């Protein structure tokens, strides 16, 4: 699937690095890669990067 | 005066107005442990909440 694994942001998150992304509640994260229990990789509003896995809820 | 103090371990960007930002080595003073996960305190003139696990207590 072009969007791959997707999820919806539960809370606000501000990237604290160029390797991270940011989102507002209800934003959609796509092409997720669950690389570890802490940080996942994915896309959000044109930005590619890491984010807290616990800040989103998987939803296809 | 500076109450309970700590040093920032990692970079953190406030997600909201109720939160504060800091870089590694920054000092957080007057810490209030209003929760095991989220503390409150002062950093670089700002007051608010931050991840307790992102700082190391140090007096």
């Amino acid at each position: 699937n072009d969007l791959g694994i997707t999820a919806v942001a539960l809370y606000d998150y501000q990237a604290a690095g160029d390797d991270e992304i940011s989102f507002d509640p209800d934003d959609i994260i796509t092409n997720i890669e669950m690389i570890d229990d802490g940080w996942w990789r994915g896309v959000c509003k044109g930005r590619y990067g890491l984010f807290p896995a616990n800040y989103v809820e998987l939803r296809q | 005066d500076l109450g309970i103090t700590a040093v920032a371990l990692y970079d953190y960007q406030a997600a909201g107005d109720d939160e504060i930002s800091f870089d590694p080595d920054d000092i957080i003073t007057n810490i209030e442990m209003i929760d095991d996960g989220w503390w409150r305190g002062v950093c670089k003139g700002r007051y608010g909440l931050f991840p307790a696990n992102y700082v190391e207590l140090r007096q």
Binding site: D12, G38, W39, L50 | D35, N53, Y54
Partner: peptide, 9 residues
């Protein structure tokens, strides 16, 4: 990398 921050209170 650093640990993720806990979900907001």
């Amino acid at each position: 990398k650093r640990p993720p921050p806990p979900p907001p209170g």
